[PDB]
Amino acid sequence: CYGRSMATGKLVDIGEAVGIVAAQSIGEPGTQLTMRTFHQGGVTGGADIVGGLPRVQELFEARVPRNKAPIADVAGRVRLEESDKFFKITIVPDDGGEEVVYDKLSKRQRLRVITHEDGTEGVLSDGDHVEVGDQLMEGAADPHEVLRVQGPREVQIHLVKEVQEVYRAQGVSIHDKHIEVIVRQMLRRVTIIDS
Amino acid sequence: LTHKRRLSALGPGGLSRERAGLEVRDVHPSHYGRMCPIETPEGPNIGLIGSLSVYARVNPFGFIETPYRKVEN
Amino acid sequence: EVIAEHPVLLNRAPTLHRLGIQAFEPQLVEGKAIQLHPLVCEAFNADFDGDQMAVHLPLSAEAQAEARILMLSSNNILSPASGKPLAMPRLDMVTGLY
Amino acid sequence: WLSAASFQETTRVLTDAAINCRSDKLNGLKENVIIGKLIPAGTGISRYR
Amino acid sequence: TGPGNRPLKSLSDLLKGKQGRFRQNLLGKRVDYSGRSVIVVGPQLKLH
Amino acid sequence: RRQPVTVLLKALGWTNEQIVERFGFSEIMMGTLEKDTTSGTDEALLDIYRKLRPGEPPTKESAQTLLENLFFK
Amino acid sequence: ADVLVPPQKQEILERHEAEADAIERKYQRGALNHTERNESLVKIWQDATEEVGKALEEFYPADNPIITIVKSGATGNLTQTRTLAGMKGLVTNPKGEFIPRPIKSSFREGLTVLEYFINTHGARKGLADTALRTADSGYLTRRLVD
Amino acid sequence: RDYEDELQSERDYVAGLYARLDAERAQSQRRYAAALREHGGTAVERDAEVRALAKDIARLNVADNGLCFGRLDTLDDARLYIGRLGIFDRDNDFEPLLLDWRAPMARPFYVATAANPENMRRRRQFHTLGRKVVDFTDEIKILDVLKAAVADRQELPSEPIPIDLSDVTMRIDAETAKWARDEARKTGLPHNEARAEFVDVVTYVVTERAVARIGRGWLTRDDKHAWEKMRADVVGELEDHEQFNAALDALWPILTPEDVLAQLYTSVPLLDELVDLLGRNKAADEAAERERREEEAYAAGVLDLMVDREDLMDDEDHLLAQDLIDAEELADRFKEQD
């Protein structure tokens, strides 16, 4: 499962300390990333987020992102409802019954832009189609919400992709297997409700 | 020579060596003519320790003052 | 004669990654400075403008074999992080071959 | 608990371990170095040792 | 406090703070058969 | 602990008439004087002495002496 | 003799100074507040710096040592070459915001007294920041290893 | 007839503004991505440019919809468009195409009228849906009781409250409750939040009297050590006293909408609304302090992990992170902050 050892170029050997190597590889380029402001005086730097070590911390610690964005619980046609300054979205399933609704969305945040090159439309509008777990706003999703909507495998992939994108946007190159090894430790426990 | 004319910002009644990060060791626009803004130790005491400028003498009260040329008309 | 074929570990703190400690075969040289190969500098992240290295000596047979095989510099060309070569031409060499 | 006491409140961890009378198996890197045993990784595993 | 104005460090005061076991073992100890020295560039050396 | 400014003014020997005649520019201080419950200068000294050290008995003479000792010596 | 200064630099500086004068005039008209005036000046001067860098890149011969070192990948980057032979550009005040007035003089020409003094702010700030930069990196590394 | 043509012309101009708005954002995003990847400058310079670009990008994004509010016409006939951003034409001496509503020049949009002619001609207001203009207009009781009922919870003792301390028989009078209540109300925090101020004021006043009364004639000039320790010791015992805790519970105690509402009537919208007024007090959040201590205990180890100055092997003795940030700041650095 691990694959070839990047140092030797062949299949990893039994007894390899994969965890320490992964941790060191992740941490060595940490100083090359953008970092939150050091000025004690001024204003809080959380609002002026920068995609670096703060974002890596926000992902690894499995916290709720400050600029949280919603996701689609059930796939279906999306109806966008405008209001005075807020707006509401409702997804009606094409293979189901009741329709889910999100109403705390505000016009102050840009809507998720369809990234398809040929489509070119950008922001999703009324009458569009989305799948389960699709993001509906521009920002960062909630890992807990992703785990609730989908299986444990999906949330792990999402976390790996987010961390890898954060590290790659600044020129640091790290293989995905180290990120996967780090993430795997976050899904090793199951909470028991009743005995 | 540099040691004798040194301006330390620590000691009895001063700031700690583990405090005042990037708030008191920054170059204020008032150093000009009273405290050299380029020459300072690179060790723990960066910014906290500096040197007096060439043209500067301490006011009897204890305020560093610098000379200037009067301009009229 | 005794020093022959006796690996010695060289370290440059901080050891941000495992390549910060590497085994080399020592050769006696007159002077007071340790001669370091120009290629491994990137692995150690050091420049010859005052940096110093720490030297450690394995004693037991197991330790000597470990330094000779696992930690030998010649066997650690590629970076364990991504596999991209790390002991490659740099600065002047790049200007030469170019 | 031997590894937990490294970065947690030592008194609390030790009290919780003593009251529970639970034993720590020396599988890992943090605890083995403290005991002085060779780490159970690389050349230190029973397969090669 | 005893003499001075500092408390006496008791048994649990050990192996609990910045000093004492469960700590100061993961900070670094000194070893024999070791040395330190400045470095110079050797272009005549082989990679090993 | 936060105290009205008018209390300090009265303690020094000010009265409502003089305060309302001189500090007639800023409205905030007008509001503070409105909130003030002290009537005479003597009460202000006694109130300050009680608030400072409630444990000791409140007397006008010691109240004035402490404030006189605090900064005016 | 190898540090060549592009002849087009003066035209870019003059044009962007005229644009900055226009921005100041509009600010006097009340159409701009202080912060937006500063932002517009910063954008204008960043564009000027980019243009000067492009002119320098297109002026230097391919065989010049200074550009040969950077182009071969041996070391350095074209921003440092622009600073050495082009113009320093905007610098940061201790608070952390760009000063609307940039540094026109190149280090080859030699910075003046005021330009040097305003430049010292960023140097001191960075030399103080370089050590505190490693604290959070080590914190994250020791989390990751634990 | 011309309304359809006028609306179409306004539609085109708003589209023209969005053309500049999109172009500016694309340029900023390219700069922001380039700065993150290959800035090549100093770390401070890299961060400063990145922060400005990231801040600028957010500024444009917020105005991506409803950019314009209306067009103002002055006696000079100048087209003083009003919107959420200040867009100027660089090719035309930075002539303002769209003024910001906060700018002084855009003042008459709100402080001008036919009765107050601040050199203003016809004034228009836009009605918009999405990134396009739809139309335009042209011109030439129980809530107070609920709070009052909540205030009634902050009563005062009918008779002096005897603390019955371990050594000194302390007493609490109506003045102390009155003074304590005044500070709690001044802060303006909810009843559950104001409890801390009330407790602190009540505890502080009682503690001071006990400290002096206990040592009356024995601790008067010995302020070297017997001036602050006793107050802390009395505070620790006082906070644990059962009678003192009940006395605080007698007046201005923890209240809930159900208990409060029932008592007011027996003396849904209100229940949910009253929750905000009631708020939360974070009663004895000891666990949070334990997490704080754990995090602080962690950071001191992190700082100790790093190289000390005892044996440095760098070219020159440079500053270290141990000389700028302490354990508490490093621990507080990574808090939730949400």
Ligand SMILES: [Mg+2]
């Ligand atoms: Mg060096």
